[PDB]
Structure formats: structure tokens, C-alpha cells
Design a protein around this ligand. Structure first.
Ligand SMILES: Nc1ncnc2c1ncn2[C@@H]1O[C@H](COP(=O)(O)OP(=O)(O)OP(=O)(O)O)[C@@H](O)[C@H]1O
Ligand SMILES: Nc1ncnc2c1ncn2[C@@H]1O[C@H](COP(=O)(O)OP(=O)(O)O)[C@@H](O)[C@H]1O
Ligand SMILES: N[C@@H](CCCC[NH3+])C(=O)O
Ligand SMILES: [Mg+2]
Ligand SMILES: [Mg+2]
Ligand SMILES: [Mg+2]
Length: 353
């Protein structure tokens, strides 16, 4: 049995912990917040700030098999970069790739440098899409029909939002599984489903990884627009939501793949269906689709229910959020599991949908 140390116990942390458990690993969580979202889901929880008490993390590195940063606190990431050589185990992160991916303008410069299409900057005709340069989870992202000077202003690209994940070992780049990102009125993601292979998007994603070169994990997001694919962002950190869909649809565990990248290496390149979604239990049990910004306000996140083809997680707080995971051989069977999962909530917990 191997042990993974996660630095960060929110949404990235949950995803990493979930897949680590599927891989039969023990999960040690480090988080500065006593109310860290996944504190009770991890096998061990150590509450400290790694910047304030680095010696505690370095000591932990002697008794775990890897340390995975799963947060987007630049102060934390920059600090970890400064002490990474002192770790007694691998740090599963690409600091150079993250420096590029965290800044959307820097990323767009990178896309342009290797000839990858990306939305036009500063269009003359509405609608415009605006977003901050360095956020995530669609925070500050909005359509426009006194902005900060570094706000991105782009042409609004209509179409499907699609994600691919890539794990590189510095030499080989494993492009994994296409996923569809289902968006709500805030442009946040409330649902993820798998998609068939897209050779063009796979090649683009490979090239984005290869030109760094990536030793770590990165995802690529694109909009399949009316005039073709436009890459909107990359994020060189462990993603939330999509890795669960990747796991059930393709059989690939991204935590295992990332660990392999830093130990033995990776090789390039199941066809099953999966539905992953978030539903808030509103007033009187009204079920409402919500995105990650709502889950991020939660107080306690862990497993609620499981049967064959169904996993349900509950994010407690001011109105709970259920994260539902359904899988099966095809869309029909998966839809039937979704129906069963919802019926459990309906009959036993008074939900309405
Ligand atoms: N230096 C650190 N040491 C320990 N844990 C940290 C550190 N920096 C961030 N974290 C934890 O990582 C988790 C994810 O942080 P991140 O900044 O990515 O998301 P966030 O939603 O902005 O978090 P926050 O609750 O701070 O607003 C949080 O639970 C946070 O407490
Ligand atoms: N140029 C654009 N046109 C249309 N929609 C966009 C555009 N850029 C971003 N979006 C939408 O906003 C969401 C968040 O933008 P993204 O660049 O992926 O930032 P992130 O860091 O916040 O998640 C996307 O998933 C997509 O739905
Ligand atoms: N870093 C934040 C946001 C991650 C959003 C990724 N889609 C968290 O771990 O909760
Ligand atoms: Mg992003
Ligand atoms: Mg995004
Ligand atoms: Mg993303």
C-alpha cells in the first residue's frame, strides 16, 4: 500500500483523494483550515500552513510516497518551489508549466507561439466575454452585451466546452479522455460527460504538453465554435470533476498515471459511459443544478451512498450539495442508474426532480 500527501483539501483535493482511494492508496491531507472541506474524507488530517511550518511537511515527506499540491494559492506554490529539493519523496507538480497556465494572457501567448487557435482579443462587436487573468472555476467570467486593466476581453465563442487531460513525464505525453463540460448561467460547470475521440484536439493537447515539456498533469479546455476549435485555457494542476468521468469512461486513473510519470515514466495513448453532476438540495427538497463555486462554500464533503453504478457524495452546509456519479456500459444503462440514484434521493430524502 502506498500513501499520498495532499496539500489542499477543497475541490482539487477531493478529486485527488477520491482517485487515490480507488487506487488503494492511503490519503494524508495537509490544510491550513481546520474546517477544510475534505478533512473527514482523508485518512489522516494535519492542520497547518505549509509556509509557516515547512518542517512539518518535510517530515511528512519522509513517510509518504509522494506529495501532490492540490491548491491554487500562488504563495503556497511559489513557496513549495523554493523548498522542493528538500523533499524526501517526489513532488508531483510542474512549476514552470503552472507559471504559464495560471495566467490566461501568458497562456494565450503560448498558444499563439505554437500556432494553436484561441479566441480573438478585443473584438469590436458584441457580445464580449470577460474574465480575470488568474482565477479558476469561472470566477469573474461573464458575458457582456470600468473593468480592471488586466481583464481579458475576448470574442464570445458559442459552442461545446470540451476538456482533455495530459500526463507527461518530460519525454512522453499521455493524452487521455475527451470530456464535455456542461455549463450553467454563471459559466460554472454542473455536469461532465465523456466524448468520443477527437484527433485534432488530441494532437493540439499533445503539442501543448510536448513544447514545455510537461512533467506532471495538465488539462486543456477548448470551445468547439462555429469556425472551429478555439483553445480557451490550460491548467497545469490536478483537475476536479473530469478525472472521475475519465476513470469510469476510459478505465484510466489519473492519480496512478501522474504517480507513474514521476517514478517509471509514461507511455503515449474502456469505452464506457458516465454522468457526473452537482445538485443542490434547495428549500423543500427542490433539486437545483450548481457549479463548483457553490461546492466551494461547503463545510464537510464525503461519501453519502453507493450501489453498483452509483456513487453519491454530500457537501454539507447552508443547503447541501449532492455530487452524483453514474456509470454503465452505454448511455441507456447510465441513464437508468441516474434514475435509480435520483429515486433514492426522492423516496428516502424528499427530493423533487
Ligand atoms: N500554505 C498552505 N498550507 C496549507 N493549506 C493551504 C495553503 N494554501 C492553501 N491551502 C489550502 O488549499 C485549499 C485550496 O485552496 P485554493 O486557494 O486553491 O482554493 P480557495 O477556494 O481559494 O481556498 P480558500 O478557502 O482559501 O478561499 C484550501 O482548503 C486551503 O486552505
Ligand atoms: N471566449 C469565450 N467565449 C465563450 N465562453 C467562454 C470564453 N472564455 C471562457 N468561456 C466560458 O467561461 C468558462 C470559464 O473560462 P475559462 O477560460 O475556462 O476559465 P477557468 O479558469 O475559470 O475555469 C469556460 O468553461 C467557458 O464556459
Ligand atoms: N483550487 C480550488 C479550485 C479548483 C477548481 C478546478 N476546477 C479548489 O481546489 O477548490
Ligand atoms: Mg481555469
Ligand atoms: Mg476553465
Ligand atoms: Mg478546468
Amino acid at each position: 500500500m502506498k500513501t499520498i500527501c495532499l496539500v489542499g483539501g477543497k475541490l482539487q483535493g477531493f478529486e485527488a483523494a477520491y482517485l487515490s482511494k480507488k487506487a488503494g492508496m492511503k490519503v494524508v491531507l495537509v490544510d491550513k483550515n481546520p474546517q477544510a472541506l475534505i478533512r473527514n474524507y482523508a485518512d489522516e488530517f494535519y492542520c497547518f500552513d505549509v509556509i509557516k511550518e515547512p518542517e512539518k511537511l518535510l517530515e511528512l515527506s519522509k513517510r509518504v510516497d509522494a506529495v501532490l499540491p492540490v491548491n491554487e494559492n500562488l504563495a503556497c506554490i511559489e513557496f513549495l518551489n523554493s523548498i522542493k529539493e528538500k523533499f524526501s519523496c517526489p513532488v508531483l507538480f510542474d512549476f514552470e508549466a503552472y507559471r504559464i497556465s495560471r495566467d490566461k494572457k501568458k497562456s494565450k501567448d503560448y498558444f499563439k507561439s505554437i500556432g494553436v487557435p484561441t479566441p480573438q482579443d478585443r473584438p469590436s462587436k458584441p457580445p464580449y466575454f470577460v474574465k480575470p487573468p488568474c482565477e479558476s472555476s469561472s470566477v469573474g467570467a461573464r458575458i457582456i452585451y470600468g473593468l480592471e486593466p488586466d481583464t481579458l476581453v475576448e470574442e464570445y465563442v458559442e459552442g461545446e466546452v470540451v476538456s482533455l487531460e495530459v500526463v507527461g513525464d518530460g519525454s512522453h505525453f499521455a493524452v487521455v479522455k475527451e470530456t464535455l463540460v456542461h455549463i450553467d448561467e454563471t459559466y460554472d460547470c454542473h455536469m461532465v460527460t465523456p466524448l468520443p475521440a477527437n484527433p485534432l484536439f488530441r494532437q493540439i493537447s499533445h503539442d501543448l504538453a510536448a513544447n514545455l515539456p510537461l512533467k506532471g498533469i495538465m488539462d486543456v479546455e477548448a470551445i468547439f465554435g462555429p469556425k472551429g476549435l478555439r483553445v480557451i485555457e490550460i491548467d497545469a494542476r490536478f483537475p476536479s470533476q473530469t478525472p472521475t468521468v475519465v476513470y469510469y469512461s476510459s478505465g484510466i486513473n489519473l492519480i496512478e498515471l501522474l504517480f507513474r510519470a514521476f517514478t517509471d515514466g509514461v507511455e503515449e495513448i474502456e469505452n464506457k459511459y458516465c454522468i457526473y453532476e452537482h445538485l443542490m438540495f434547495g428549500e423543500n427538497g427542490v433539486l437545483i443544478p450548481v457549479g463548483e463555486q457553490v461546492l466551494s462554500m461547503g463545510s464537510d464533503y464525503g461519501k453519502f451512498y453507493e450501489e453498483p453504478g452509483i456513487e453519491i457524495f454530500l457537501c454539507k452546509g447552508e443547503y447541501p450539495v449532492f455530487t452524483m456519479v453514474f456509470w454503465g456500459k452505454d448511455r441507456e444503462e447510465t441513464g437508468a442508474k441516474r434514475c435509480k440514484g435520483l429515486s433514492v434521493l426522492k423516496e428516502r430524502f424528499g427530493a423533487v426532480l
